[PDB]
Amino acid sequence: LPEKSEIVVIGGGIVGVTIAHELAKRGEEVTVIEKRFIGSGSTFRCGTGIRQQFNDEANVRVMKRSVELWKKYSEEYGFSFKQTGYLFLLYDDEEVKTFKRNIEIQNKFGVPTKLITPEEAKEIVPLLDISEVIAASWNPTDGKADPFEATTAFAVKAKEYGAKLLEYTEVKGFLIENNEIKGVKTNKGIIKTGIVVNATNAWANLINAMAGIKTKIPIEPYKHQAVITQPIKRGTINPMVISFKYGHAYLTQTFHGGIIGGIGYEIGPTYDLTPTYEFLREVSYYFTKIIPALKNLLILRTWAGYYAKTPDSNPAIGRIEELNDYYIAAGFSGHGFMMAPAVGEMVAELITKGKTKLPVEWYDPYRFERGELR
Amino acid sequence: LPEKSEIVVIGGGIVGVTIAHELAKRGEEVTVIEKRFIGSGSTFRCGTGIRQQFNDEANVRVMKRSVELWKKYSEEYGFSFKQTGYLFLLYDDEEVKTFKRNIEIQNKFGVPTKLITPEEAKEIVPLLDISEVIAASWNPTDGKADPFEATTAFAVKAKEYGAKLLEYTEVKGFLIENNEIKGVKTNKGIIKTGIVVNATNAWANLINAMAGIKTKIPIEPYKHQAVITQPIKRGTINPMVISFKYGHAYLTQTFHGGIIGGIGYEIGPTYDLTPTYEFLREVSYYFTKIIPALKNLLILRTWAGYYAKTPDSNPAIGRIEELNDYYIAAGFSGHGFMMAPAVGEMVAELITKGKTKLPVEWYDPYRFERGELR
Amino acid sequence: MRPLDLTEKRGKKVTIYFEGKELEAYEGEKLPVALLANEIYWLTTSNEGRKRGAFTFGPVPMTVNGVKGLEARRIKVKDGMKIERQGYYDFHEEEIERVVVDVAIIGGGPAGIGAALELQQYLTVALIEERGWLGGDMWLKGIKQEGFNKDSRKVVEELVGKLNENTKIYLETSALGVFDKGEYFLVPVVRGDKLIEILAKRVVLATGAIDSTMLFENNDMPGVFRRDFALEVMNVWEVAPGRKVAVTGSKADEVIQELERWGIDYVHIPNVKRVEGNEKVERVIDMNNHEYKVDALIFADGRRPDINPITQAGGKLRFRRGYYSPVLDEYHRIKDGIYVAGSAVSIKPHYANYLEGKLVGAYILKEFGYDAQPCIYEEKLREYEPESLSIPRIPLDKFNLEDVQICGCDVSLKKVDEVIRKGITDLQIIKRLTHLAMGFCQGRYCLFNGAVVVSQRTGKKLSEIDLPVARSPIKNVKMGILAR
Amino acid sequence: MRPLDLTEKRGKKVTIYFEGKELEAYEGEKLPVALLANEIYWLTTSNEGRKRGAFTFGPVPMTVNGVKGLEARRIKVKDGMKIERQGYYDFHEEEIERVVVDVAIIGGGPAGIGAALELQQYLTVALIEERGWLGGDMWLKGIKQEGFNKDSRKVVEELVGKLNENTKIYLETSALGVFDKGEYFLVPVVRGDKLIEILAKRVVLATGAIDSTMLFENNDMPGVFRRDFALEVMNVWEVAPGRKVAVTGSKADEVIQELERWGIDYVHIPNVKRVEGNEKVERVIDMNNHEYKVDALIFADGRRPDINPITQAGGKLRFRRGYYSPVLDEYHRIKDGIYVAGSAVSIKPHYANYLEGKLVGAYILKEFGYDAQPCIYEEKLREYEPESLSIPRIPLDKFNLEDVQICGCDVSLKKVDEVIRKGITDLQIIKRLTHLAMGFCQGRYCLFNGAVVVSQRTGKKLSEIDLPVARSPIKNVKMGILAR
Ligand SMILES: Cc1cc2nc3c(=O)[nH]c(=O)nc-3n(C[C@H](O)[C@H](O)[C@H](O)COP(=O)(O)OP(=O)(O)OC[C@H]3O[C@@H](n4cnc5c(N)ncnc54)[C@H](O)[C@@H]3O)c2cc1C
Ligand SMILES: Cc1cc2nc3c(=O)[nH]c(=O)nc-3n(C[C@H](O)[C@H](O)[C@H](O)COP(=O)(O)OP(=O)(O)OC[C@H]3O[C@@H](n4cnc5c(N)ncnc54)[C@H](O)[C@@H]3O)c2cc1C
Ligand SMILES: Cc1cc2nc3c(=O)[nH]c(=O)nc-3n(C[C@H](O)[C@H](O)C(O)COP(=O)(O)O)c2cc1C
Ligand SMILES: Cc1cc2nc3c(=O)[nH]c(=O)nc-3n(C[C@H](O)[C@H](O)C(O)COP(=O)(O)O)c2cc1C
Ligand SMILES: Nc1ncnc2c1ncn2[C@@H]1O[C@H](COP(=O)(O)OP(=O)(O)OP(=O)(O)O)[C@@H](O)[C@H]1O
Ligand SMILES: Nc1ncnc2c1ncn2[C@@H]1O[C@H](COP(=O)(O)OP(=O)(O)OP(=O)(O)O)[C@@H](O)[C@H]1O
Ligand SMILES: [Cl-]
Ligand SMILES: [Cl-]
Ligand SMILES: [Fe+3]
Ligand SMILES: [Fe+3]
Domain segments of chain D as ranges: 1-94, 95-211+303-388+466-484, 212-302, 389-465
Laid out side by side, the sheet with B326-330 consists of B164-166, B30-33, B7-10, B195-198, B326-330, B316-320
Q: Which of C302, C297, C292 is nearest to C247 (CA)?
A: C297
Range of the domain at B301: 83-141+219-310
Contact C8, C19 (CB under 8 A): no
Same domain, yes or no, for A135 and A228? yes
Q: Which of D215, D217, D187 is nearest to D200 (CA)?
A: D187
Cross-strand bridge partners of residue A82: A144
Q: Which of C333, C435, C479, C318 is nearest to C386 (CA)?
A: C318
Kindly give, in sequence order, each residue whose CB lies less than 8 Å from that of residue C369, ignoring residues fewer than 6 positions away. Answer: none
DSSP A4: B
Residue A76 has phi, psi (to 5 degrees) of -65, -30
Contact D471, D312 (CB under 8 A): yes
All chains having 3 or more CB pairs closer than 8 angstroms to chain C: A, D
Angle at B144 between CA B143 and CA B148, to 5 degrees: 150
Tell me the CATH number for domain C1-94. 3.10.20.440
CA D324/CA B289 separation, integer angstroms: 41
Pairing of strands A164-166, A30-33: parallel
Mutation for testing the D interface, residue in B40, B152, B225, B280 having most D CBs under 10 Å: B280
Domain count, chain B: 2
Q: Is B176 exposed, middle or buried (0-12, 13-18, 19+ CB in 10 A)?
A: middle
Cross-strand bridge partners of residue A20: none
What residues are in contact with ligand 2 under a 6 Å CB criterion?
B 10-16, 33-36, 40-43, 45-49, 170-171, 199-203, 224, 226, 262, 305-307, 332, 334-338
CA C295/CA A16 separation, integer angstroms: 57
Contact C172, C127 (CB under 8 A): no
Same domain, yes or no, for A159 and A97? no
Q: Which of B305, B346, B358, B272 is nearest to B15 (CA)?
A: B346
Return the amino acid letter for C180.
Answer: D
Instruction: Supply the CATH number for residue B45's domain.
Output: 3.50.50.60
Sign of CA dihedral A147, A152, A158, A164: positive
Measured between CB atoms, does D179 come within 8 Å of chain B? yes
Residue A58 CB–ligand 3 contact under 6 Å: no
Same domain, yes or no, for B146 and B48? yes
What is the Rg, in whole angstroms, of the alpha carbon atoms belonging to chain D?
A: 22
Q: Nearest ligand to the C-alpha of residue C470? A: 3
Pairing of strands D283-286, D291-293: antiparallel
Final residue in a domain of this structure, among A310, A330, A349: A310
Q: What is the DSSP string of B106-136?
A: HHHTT---EEE-HHHHHHSSTT---TT--EE
Among the partner-chain residues C268, C388, C390, the one whose CB lies closest to the CB of D321 is: C388
Helix (H, G, I), strand (E, B) or coil at D432: helix
Pairing of strands C338-340, C203-205: parallel
Measured between CB atoms, does A172 come within 8 Å of chain C? no
Contact B52, B59 (CB under 8 A): no
Contact D280, D42 (CB under 8 A): yes
Determine A/C contact with 3+ CB pairs under 8 A as the test: yes
CA C154/CA D90 separation, integer angstroms: 62
CA D469/CA D193 separation, integer angstroms: 27
Q: How many C-beta atoms lie closer than 10 Å to residue D158's C-beta?
A: 12
Measured between CB atoms, does B313 come within 8 Å of chain D? no
Q: Is D479 exposed, middle or buried (0-12, 13-18, 19+ CB in 10 A)?
A: buried
Helices A147-160 and A57-77: crossing angle in degrees, nearest 10, is: 70
Q: C484 to chain A: nearest residue by CA?
A: A285
Ligand 8 centroid – CA B253 distance (Å): 21
Pairing of strands D244-248, D265-268: parallel
Measured between CB atoms, does B235 come within 8 Å of chain D? no
Return the amino acid letter for D72.
Answer: A
- Residue D209 CA to chain centroid, in angstroms? 7
Residue A277, Ramachandran bin (φ over 0: left; ψ between -120 and 50: alpha; else beta): alpha
Query: Binding site annotation covers B101?
Result: no
What is the Rg, in whole angstroms, of the alpha carbon atoms belonging to chain A?
A: 21
- Residue B71 CA to chain centroid, in angstroms? 17
CB contact under 8 A, D268 and C290: no
Among the partner-chain residues C267, C271, C388, the one whose CB lies closest to the CB of D388 is: C388
Helix (H, G, I), strand (E, B) or coil at A63: helix
CA distances from D183 to D127, D179, D365, D474 (A): 21, 11, 18, 22
Q: How far is D54 from chain C (nearest CA, A)?
A: 30
Query: In chain C, which residues have their Cβ closer than 8 Å to the Cβ of A230?
Result: 440, 476
CA D74/CA D72 separation, integer angstroms: 5
CB contact under 8 A, D478 and B297: yes
Same domain, yes or no, for B147 and B127? no
CA distances from A333 to A221, A240, B52, B366, C200 (A): 9, 18, 109, 108, 37
CB contact under 8 A, D288 and C267: yes
Contact D231, D136 (CB under 8 A): no
Q: Which of D65, D69, D62, D60 is nearest to D79 (CA)?
A: D65
CA C327/CA C435 separation, integer angstroms: 28
Same domain, yes or no, for B248 and B329? no
- Residue C34 CA to chain centroid, in angstroms? 20
Contact C186, A277 (CB under 8 A): yes
Determine B/D contact with 3+ CB pairs under 8 A as the test: yes
Final residue in a domain of this structure, among B310, B334, B356: B310
Final residue in a domain of this structure, among B272, B292, B310: B310
Instruction: Supply the CATH number for residue B93's domain.
Output: 3.30.9.10
Helices A57-77 and A93-108: crossing angle in degrees, nearest 10, is: 70
Helix (H, G, I), strand (E, B) or coil at B327: strand
CA distances from C129 to C31, C175, C176 (A): 20, 8, 12
CA C387/CA C346 separation, integer angstroms: 8
CB contact under 8 A, B300 and D438: yes
Same domain, yes or no, for B231 and B271? yes
Domain spanning C389-465, CATH class: mainly alpha
DSSP A168: S
Angle at C14 between CA C9 and CA C19, to 5 degrees: 115
CB contact under 8 A, D472 and B302: yes
Q: How many C-beta atoms lie closer than 10 Å to residue C150's C-beta?
A: 12
Same domain, yes or no, for A350 and A372? yes
Is the backbone peptide bond immediately before D269 cis, with ω within 30 degrees of 0?
no
Q: Nearest ligand to the C-alpha of residue A34? A: 1
Cross-strand bridge partners of residue C285: C274, C291
Helix (H) or strand (E) holding A192: strand A189-192
Contact A8, A141 (CB under 8 A): no
Resolution (angstroms) equals 2.9
CA distances from C292 to C245, C247, C274 (A): 10, 11, 11
Q: How many C-beta atoms lie closer than 10 Å to residue B137's C-beta?
A: 24
Measured between CB atoms, does B284 come within 8 Å of chain D? yes
CA D76/CA D27 separation, integer angstroms: 8
Contact D270, C287 (CB under 8 A): yes
CA D318/CA D325 separation, integer angstroms: 5
CA D257/CA D359 separation, integer angstroms: 31
Q: Which of D264, D238, D343, D309 is nearest to D472 (CA)?
A: D309
Method: X-ray
Contact A49, A79 (CB under 8 A): no
Same domain, yes or no, for A7 and A64? yes
Query: Binding site annotation covers B318?
Result: no
CA B129/CA C383 separation, integer angstroms: 59
CA B275/CA B303 separation, integer angstroms: 5
Q: What is the DSSP string of C257-314?
A: HHHHHHT-EEEE-SSEEEEE-SSS--EEEETT--EEE-SEEEE---EEE--HHHHHTT
| Long-range CB pairs of C317-326, under 8 A, 24+ apart, other chains included | C317/C466, C317/C467, C319/C462, C319/C463, C320/D385, C321/C346, C321/C347, C321/C386, C321/C387, C321/C388, C321/C389, C321/D385, C321/D388, C322/C388, C322/C389, C322/C390, C322/C391, C322/D388, C323/C347, C323/C389, C323/C448, C324/C448, C324/C467
Query: In chain D, which residues have their Cβ closer than 8 Å to the Cβ of B298?
Result: 440, 476-479
Q: D470 to chain B: nearest residue by CA?
A: B301
Cross-strand bridge partners of residue D151: D144
Helix (H, G, I), strand (E, B) or coil at C17: strand
Measured between CB atoms, does C288 come within 8 Å of chain D? yes
CA C109/CA C127 separation, integer angstroms: 10
Helix (H) or strand (E) holding D448: helix D447-458
Measured between CB atoms, does C78 come within 8 Å of chain D? no
Q: How many C-beta atoms lie closer than 10 Å to residue D480's C-beta?
A: 17
Return the amino acid letter for A239.
Answer: P
| Shortest-distance atom of ligand 2 to CA B307 | 53
Overall fold of domain D95-211+303-388+466-484:
FAD/NAD(P)-binding domain (3.50.50)
Residue C443, Ramachandran bin (φ over 0: left; ψ between -120 and 50: alpha; else beta): left
Cross-strand bridge partners of residue A320: A326
Query: In chain A, which residues have their Cβ closer than 8 Å to the Cβ of C179?
Result: 276-277
Ligand 4 centroid – CA D412 distance (Å): 19
Query: In chain B, which residues have their Cβ closer than 8 Å to the Cβ of D314?
Result: 274
Helix (H, G, I), strand (E, B) or coil at A149: helix
Contact B9, B19 (CB under 8 A): yes
Measured between CB atoms, does D48 come within 8 Å of chain B? no
CA C257/CA D453 separation, integer angstroms: 19
Cross-strand bridge partners of residue C16: C23
Q: Which of B163, B114, B167 is nearest to B136 (CA)?
A: B114
Among the partner-chain residues C87, C186, C476, the one whose CB lies closest to the CB of A298 is: C476
Ligand 5 centroid – CA C107 distance (Å): 4
Interface contacts (C, D; CB < 8 Å):
32
Mutation for testing the A interface, residue in C181, C407, C482 having most A CBs under 10 Å: C482
| Binding-site positions of C for FMN | 431-432, 438, 442, 471
Same domain, yes or no, for A339 and A315? yes
Query: In chain C, which residues have their Cβ closer than 8 Å to the Cβ of A256?
Result: 435, 438
Q: Nearest ligand to the C-alpha of residue D111? A: 6
Q: Which of B23, B18, B29, B372 is nearest to B194 (CA)?
A: B29
Same domain, yes or no, for A326 and A365? yes
CA D375/CA D379 separation, integer angstroms: 6
Ligand 5 centroid – CA C395 distance (Å): 32
Contact C296, C245 (CB under 8 A): yes
Same domain, yes or no, for B164 and B282? no
CA A266/CA A249 separation, integer angstroms: 12
CA A335/CA D128 separation, integer angstroms: 73
Measured between CB atoms, does A48 come within 8 Å of chain C? no
Sign of CA dihedral C156, C161, C165, C169: positive
Q: What is the largest CA-CA distance in chain A?
A: 65
Cross-strand bridge partners of residue C26: C13
Q: Nearest ligand to the C-alpha of residue B200? A: 2
Contact D47, B231 (CB under 8 A): yes
Ligand 2 centroid – CA B215 distance (Å): 22
Q: A296 to chain C: nearest residue by CA?
A: C478
CA C227/CA D430 separation, integer angstroms: 38
Q: What is the largest CA-CA distance in chain B?
A: 65
Q: Nearest ligand to the C-alpha of residue B155? A: 2
Measured between CB atoms, does B275 come within 8 Å of chain D? yes
